[PDB]
Structure formats: structure tokens, C-alpha cells
Design a protein around this ligand. Structure first.
Ligand code: HEM
Ligand SMILES: Nc1n[nH]cc1-c1ccc(O)cc1
Length: 394
């Protein structure tokens, strides 16, 4: 025999497997086995991905229930899976959303400054440079310290939790709990620290002492700090790293963007569309029996929404693998999800990538890989696809 098709198919974030277009054409929803042994439905067309993400009966929260078929082990307490629902129930959604927009005074200039400094330091040191460890990740870390209102010097230690926190493991991870409890203690300290008066933590700290929020738990306040730092940093650092690969490998596009930087937002949007940063489909648990294409998904089954399945669907995005700056539906991709759980940091993520790319093209217009592309080491069993190092010269 064969065996039931296993997911994920590949940890490489520089190319989509030809298999994905085959699945999408032949079986855009089909049964697969996850790393835990569970069965799941893998959905790989734009039409069916959108259907699942816009129907709340495919629940994010219920993926955390004891006994459910699992994509991977939880790395957070089960109540934290419903992190945005908990924020909304506490009456904090508007305030959190306001704090993480890129439009706060000085934020963009801070980003440009940070990027330019990181690049000057690479240039001083001489090629080769590692653009993930010494540019994309420290730019994301600095950004999220600023947005949180926490000291920049605390960013590296918070960051180092992330190579465990965002693992995609078959089994529970003891180091994840150790790092989680310590990071929650750090954020609780921030909330009690009178010097912290700006950003998302300064705003939470004020709301904590307002009568309108007196019955919101200290644990929820700390948890917002830890979760927004971690999701934001991993997601922006990983997206920028793999977007830089896709740009480096298209000298014609690199040169057009360098020359006409007003096209950078359109090119970022295409880079988001083609991005293979999410290593796994987005999980949902069916709360009812729901027809999805030719399959009747049954109550209690796991569904996995394959982002690249949707974003490379030629029925929605003709010539899907090409970066085309003049598409008529450019923001209609699923790179930030869709529906109830649409990314709350989408603007912030776009801006981080736009600024980092602008700054890199101006400082290193001759940027190129310093190693053959096949020599990049792809991180395995993780919730993002990322090269461990990204060696470049210029
Ligand atoms: C390019 C950067 C980013 C990408 C590609 C990205 C992508 C995503 C995707 C696909 C989802 C949907 C998950 C789902 O439906 O299961 C999501 C949710 C989430 N994002 Fe992002 N994200 C980015 C940046 C950020 C930033 C900057 C933050 C915070 C500062 C952030 C915080 C979150 C949180 C807290 C959620 C969960 C929302 C919910 O459960 O309602 N993201 N993101
Ligand atoms: N910050 C985190 N570390 N490990 C898991 C998370 C996390 C969990 C949920 C979430 O909405 C955002 C982030």
C-alpha cells in the first residue's frame, strides 16, 4: 500500500511543491494525516479556503478541546488559543488594535532608522552578511519593543523564546512552558513598572487601573503582551526573510523597485500573495456537519486551510507564480487570513516589510545570495518556513 498523504509536504519556503497544483485540480479538499497521527481535511482552492474561513462553525477556539484531532501540540495554555475572543470579551479590541497600527507618530521613522543602522553595520563588517539573523529578525524585534513600549534591550531574550514557542510538534514541549511562564512574569512586571507609559503596554497599564476594566484579569493583560510580541515578531521576521529571497532571485524586479520605489507597496503586496511563510494550513474544528466541495465534513473533524493553496490558485490569480504589480485584485490574497480571525497586525506587517525592503534596496542595490540557493537550511517542524541563515553579498 501507500499510506494516507502526510502534511506538511515540504519545509522549503523558496518554492511551492508541484504537488499543490495537482491537489488543487484533482482534490481541493482531501484527507491527510498530521504529525500527531490525526486525520484532517486539507483545503487547497481559493473558493474552498474562503468558504471555511468565513464560516465560524469551522471554529479556531474548538481546536483546543481535549480529545480533538490535532495538527500539533499546544505551546500555550488552551484558553490562549481563543486570545482575540478573550481580548474582545474584556472590551480591549479597539484599544489593542489602535496601539499596533504603524501610524503612531515617529514609528515609521524609527523603523527606517533601525533598518538603516542594521544595514550600515553589515556594510562596515563586510560580506557575506546573514539577512535573517542580522537584519530581518532584529528589525522585527526592535519594531515590537517599540510598539509594546518596552525597553529595546529586553527584545533579544524575548526573541529567543520564539524558536520553541512557534514549534509545530507532535508532543507537548517542556521548554515552551518554562519560557511562557517566564515571559508572562516579565510582562506582569511591565504592567507594574511606572516607567512604561507608551505603546501597547503603557496603554494596557492605564486601562488596568481604570474602573471600566477592574474585573479584567492580570493574566489577560500579561498574555496580550507575550502573544502580540511573539506572533508579531515571528510573523514579520519570517515574512521579510523569505520575501527578500524572492526579491533577490528576481534581479529585474529588484532593479525596478530600486529605481521606482513608489512601486514597493505593490511589490510587497505580491510578495505577501506568493509567501510560503506559514508552514501548515490554518486549523479549524467543525462544530456541525458542513458540505465543502464534494466532502461532507463531520462535526468534530479537523480542517486545514492551505494559504498557498488559495494564493496560487490560477482561477483567482492568473499566472499565479509570477509577481505582477498591476493585478485588479491585489489585496484579495489570504496571507493575513480572512473572516473572524483576520490578522490584527496586517498594517503593521506591511509597513515593516515595505520599510525593510526600501532600506535594503537603497543601501545594497547589488544584493545577491552568497551561496547557491539550495544551500539554505530550512527550519523543520516549525509553524513558519524560514532559512536558518540567509547569506548575501552586495
Ligand atoms: C507579514 C506579517 C504577518 C503575517 C503574514 C500574518 C499572518 C496571520 C494570519 C494568516 C493570521 C490568521 C490565523 C488564523 O486565522 O488561524 C494571523 C493572525 C494573527 N496575527 Fe498575524 N501576521 C502578520 C503580522 C502580525 C503582527 C505584526 C501581529 C502583532 C503585532 C500579528 C498578530 C496576530 C494575532 C494576535 C493573530 C490571531 C488573530 C485571531 O485569532 O483572531 N500578526 N496572522
Ligand atoms: N506569543 C505566543 N507564543 N506562543 C504562542 C503564542 C501565541 C499564541 C496565540 C496567539 O494568538 C499569539 C501568539
Amino acid at each position: 500500500a501507500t499510506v494516507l498523504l502526510e502534511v506538511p509536504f515540504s519545509a522549503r519556503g523558496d518554492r511551492i511543491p508541484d504537488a499543490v497544483a495537482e491537489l488543487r485540480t484533482r482534490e481541493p479538499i482531501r484527507k491527510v494525516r498530521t504529525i500527531t497521527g490525526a486525520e484532517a481535511w486539507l483545503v487547497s482552492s481559493y473558493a474552498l479556503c474562503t468558504q471555511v474561513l468565513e464560516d465560524r462553525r469551522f471554529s479556531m477556539k474548538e481546536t483546543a478541546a481535549a480529545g480533538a484531532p490535532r495538527l500539533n501540540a499546544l505551546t500555550v495554555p488552551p484558553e490562549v488559543v481563543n486570545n482575540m475572543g478573550n481580548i474582545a470579551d474584556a472590551g480591549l479590541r479597539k484599544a489593542v488594535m489602535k496601539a499596533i497600527t504603524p501610524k503612531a507618530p515617529g514609528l515609521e521613522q524609527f523603523l527606517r532608522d533601525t533598518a538603516n543602522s542594521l544595514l550600515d553595520n553589515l556594510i562596515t563588517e563586510g560580506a557575506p552578511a546573514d539577512l535573517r539573523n542580522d537584519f530581518a529578525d532584529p528589525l522585527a524585534t526592535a519594531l515590537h519593543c517599540k510598539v509594546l513600549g518596552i525597553p529595546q534591550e529586553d527584545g533579544p531574550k524575548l526573541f529567543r523564546s520564539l524558536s520553541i514557542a512557534f514549534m509545530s510538534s507532535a508532543d507537548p514541549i517542556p521548554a515552551a512552558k518554562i519560557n511562557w511562564d517566564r515571559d508572562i512574569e516579565y510582562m506582569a512586571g511591565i504592567l507594574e513598572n511606572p516607567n512604561i507609559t507608551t505603546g501597547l503596554m503603557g496603554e494596557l497599564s492605564r486601562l488596568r487601573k481604570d474602573p471600566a476594566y477592574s474585573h479584567v484579569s492580570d493574566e489577560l493583560f500579561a498574555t496580550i503582551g507575550v502573544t502580540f510580541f511573539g506572533a508579531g515578531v515571528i510573523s514579520t521576521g519570517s515574512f521579510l526573510t523569505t520575501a527578500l529571497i524572492s526579491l533577490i532571485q528576481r534581479p529585474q524586479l529588484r532593479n525596478l523597485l530600486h529605481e521606482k520605489p513608489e512601486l514597493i507597496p505593490a511589490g510587497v503586496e505580491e510578495l505577501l500573495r506568493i509567501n510560503l511563510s506559514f508552514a501548515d494550513g490554518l486549523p479549524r474544528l467543525a462544530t456541525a456537519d458542513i458540505q465543502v466541495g464534494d466532502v461532507l465534513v463531520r462535526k468534530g473533524e479537523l480542517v486545514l486551510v492551505l494559504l498557498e493553496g488559495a494564493n496560487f490558485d490560477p482561477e483567482h490569480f492568473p499566472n499565479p507564480g509570477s509577481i505582477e504589480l498591476d493585478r485588479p485584485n491585489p489585496t484579495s490574497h489570504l496571507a493575513f487570513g480572512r473572516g473572524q480571525h483576520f490578522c490584527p497586525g496586517s498594517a503593521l506587517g506591511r509597513r515593516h516589510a515595505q520599510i525593510g525592503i526600501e532600506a535594503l534596496l537603497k543601501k545594497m542595490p547589488g544584493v545577491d545570495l552568497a551561496v547557491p540557493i539550495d544551500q539554505l537550511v530550512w527550519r523543520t517542524r516549525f509553524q513558519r518556513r524560514i532559512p536558518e541563515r540567509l547569506p548575501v553579498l552586495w
